[PDB]
Amino acid sequence: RAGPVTWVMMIACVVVFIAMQILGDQEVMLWLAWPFDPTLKFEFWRYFTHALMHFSLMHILFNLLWWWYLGGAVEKRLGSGKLIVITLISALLSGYVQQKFSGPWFGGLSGVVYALMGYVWLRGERDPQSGIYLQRGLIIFALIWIVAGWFDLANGAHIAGLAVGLAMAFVDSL
Numbered sequence: 001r002a003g004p005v006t007w008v009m010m011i012a013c014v015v016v017f018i019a020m021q022i023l024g025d026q027e028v029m030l031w032l033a034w035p036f037d038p039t040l041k042f043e044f045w046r047y048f049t050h051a052l053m054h055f056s057l058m059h060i061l062f063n064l065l066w067w068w069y070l071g072g073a074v075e076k077r078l079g080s081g082k083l084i085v086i087t088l089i090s091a092l093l094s095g096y097v098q099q100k101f102s103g104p105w106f107g108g109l110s111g112v113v114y115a116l117m118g119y120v121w122l123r124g125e126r127d128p129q130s131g132i133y134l135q136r137g138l139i140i141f142a143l144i145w146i147v148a149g150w151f152d153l154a155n156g157a158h159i160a161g162l163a164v165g166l167a168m169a170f171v172d173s174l
Ligand SMILES: *C(=O)C[C@@H](NC(=O)Oc1ccccc1)c1ccccc1
Pocket: 058, 059, 060, 062, 063, 066, 108, 109, 110, 111, 113, 114, 117, 142, 145, 146, 149
């Protein structure tokens, strides 16, 4: 059953999403978005809290499904600490890449899910004994979600998320 980091993140994303229905997306973005003005640059939660916001039912639902599954597997087999660090680094780097190319109005766990996906996949490719791997069906299901977002059926920030994941799996599998 989903560990504490996996659990607290899902609930935090649920709570934030409730606040966005109640107050509108814009007002929530006003408090949680990546610093959108120099006057806000020292509000440090904002470098991470952007990940907690979602803008549609499908967004939060598919994101939490992958988080629950991949994040849950990571937390279970490799520990909460590992999940926390992957999440912090991918959230920072994807948010940074996103704001650089498209400005600070964005949100969601996509960057983080791309990290977990790259992590779980490469970890199993190079080190099965870890007990963690991305199952064939899921390599497929995941790839169809890559293609979707890729052709918009931003990409740069998802690439950034993925690199974090691949980098950590590479490190862990030495
Ligand atoms: C973020 O990319 C929003 C996106 N969520 C999603 O793509 O998650 C995944 C799944 C597999 C690999 C990487 C990322 C999304 C798009 C459309 C509808 C809901 C969510």
